[PDB]
Each structure stands twice: as C-alpha cells, then as structure tokens.
Amino acid sequence: GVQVETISPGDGRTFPKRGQTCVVHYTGMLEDGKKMDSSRDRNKPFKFMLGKQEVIRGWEEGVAQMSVGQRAKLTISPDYAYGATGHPGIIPPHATLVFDVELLKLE
Amino acid sequence: GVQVETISPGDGRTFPKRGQTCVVHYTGMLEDGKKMDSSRDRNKPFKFMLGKQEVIRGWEEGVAQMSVGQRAKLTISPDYAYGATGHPGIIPPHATLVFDVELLKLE
C-alpha cells in the first residue's frame, strides 16, 4: 500500500474524484530518500488523470487521499510501485519508493 | 541513437538474431555516470527477446551489434530511451543514459 504522511494541510474537502486531472509537484525517491526525479527542477507541474493508470498505483492512490493545497510524503510498497521485476535498467526489483507530493490543483 | 564502445571483445561472429533470447549483465546509469540499476547487484543475468521491444530502443539496438562475450558502453540518446517526457518519478525528461552491457550468451 501507500502510507501518506502530511507535511502541509490542504483544504480538507476537495479530494480527487475519478476522471479529474491532478496537477502536482512531485519528487520521487528510493526508500532511503535518494532523489530520482523532481518536477520542481523544471518548475513545471505534472498532470495525471484518475482512472487512467497514468502513474503507479501508490502514486495515484496516495494522491486520491489528499485535498487541494496539501503536501505529503507517500511511502509506496513494491507491489504498488514496480513490483518484483521492477523496471530493469532504472529501477531494481522489490523497490519501496518515497514521493514528496503537493496537490497544486484539480481540473 | 546508441553508441557502442567495446570494453572487452566477443568471439566476433555470434551476433543476436530476432527471436533469440539475449542473456546479459548490465548496469544502467545516467549520462554523468550515476548508477540506477545493475543486474550484477543480484548476480542474476537479465534476459530479453530480440525484436519484442522488451527494453528501450538504445538498450536493444546496442546488443544487436555485440557478439557473445563482448562487454560494451552504450551511450543512448533521449530519443532512443524515455524521450522528452521521460518516466515521471524515476527518470527526468531529455535524459541520456549510459549502460555497461555484457552479452553472456544467446538462447
């Protein structure tokens, strides 16, 4: 699963519903906090629609639990990330990921 | 595309053919040499079917020019990897990758 740990509160009432487009600022890391990719380095918010499996399960499900303006740390288990085979070349097998995500807005 | 630079020679005759299974030991890293994943960390060779697009275009197209027993440094441009979009959370946009690949055998 995905363990969500709030860093900054959102509005607590505007949560992502299926079909909407999530505008976020993320930072994907390895279990120990090793930075891999951050949309903050490009100053461009990343968009993804709920129900389209555009991102990994824990990435999306962790966000569905957040309200607009919130920023939290999402600890994703391998089964919710890239599983037992991982993504050969970039992601090793059985990898737990830690994302720092901020739900900028919905659309 | 991909640039093949031989670190160690192969037999120079046994080249991969569509359908065969390529057995390799790799180490994928970014353009500056930062390591991401290595099958050697698990002492388990990696396998992929030639022509089945089971890996990024540069990964596969480099091994197709390698003979059994050869170990080479493959410099893969962004277009032959994850492109302008990359792979959000793992690899950033316009990323040149560098793989150290060893063609252990064909099967």
From Swiss-Prot, chains A, B:
What topology does the record note for this protein and the membrane?
Answer: Peripheral membrane protein
Q: Which residues carry this modification: N6-acetyllysine?
A: 52
Residue list for modification N6-succinyllysine: 52
InterPro entries, alphabetized: FKBP-type_PPIase (IPR050689), PPIase_dom_sf (IPR046357), PPIase_FKBP_dom (IPR001179)
Q: What is its main location?
A: cytoplasm
Single Gene Ontology BP annotation = T cell activation
What GO molecular function annotations does the UniProt record carry, in alphabetical order? activin receptor binding; calcium channel regulator activity; FK506 binding; I-SMAD binding; macrolide binding; peptidyl-prolyl cis-trans isomerase activity; signaling receptor inhibitor activity; transforming growth factor beta receptor binding
One matching Pfam family: FKBP_C
Pull one GO CC term from this UniProt entry: cytoplasmic side of membrane
Q: Which ranges carry the PPIase FKBP-type domain?
A: 19-107
SUPFAM superfamilies, A to Z = FKBP-like (SSF54534)
Enumerate the Gene3D superfamilies for this protein. 3.10.50.40
- The reply to whether Cytoplasm figures as a keyword in the UniProt entry is yes
For this UniProt record, give its keywords in alphabetical order, as a comma-separated list: Acetylation, Cytoplasm, Isomerase, Membrane, Rotamase, Sarcoplasmic reticulum
Q: Known activity regulation?
A: Inhibited by both FK506 and rapamycin.
Listed under catalytic activity are: [protein]-peptidylproline (omega=180) = [protein]-peptidylproline (omega=0)
Summarize subunit and interaction data from the UniProt record for this chain. Answer: Interacts with TGFBR1; prevents TGFBR1 phosphorylation by TGFBR2 and stabilizes it in the inactive conformation. Interacts with ACVR1B and SMAD7. Identified in a complex composed of RYR1, PDE4D, PKA, FKBP1A and protein phosphatase 1 (PP1). Interacts directly with RYR2 and RYR3. Interacts with GLMN; rapamycin and FK506 abolish the interaction with GLMN in a dose dependent manner. Interacts directly with RYR1.
What is the official name of this protein in its record? Peptidyl-prolyl cis-trans isomerase FKBP1A
Lineage at the top is: Eukaryota, Metazoa, Chordata, Craniata, Vertebrata
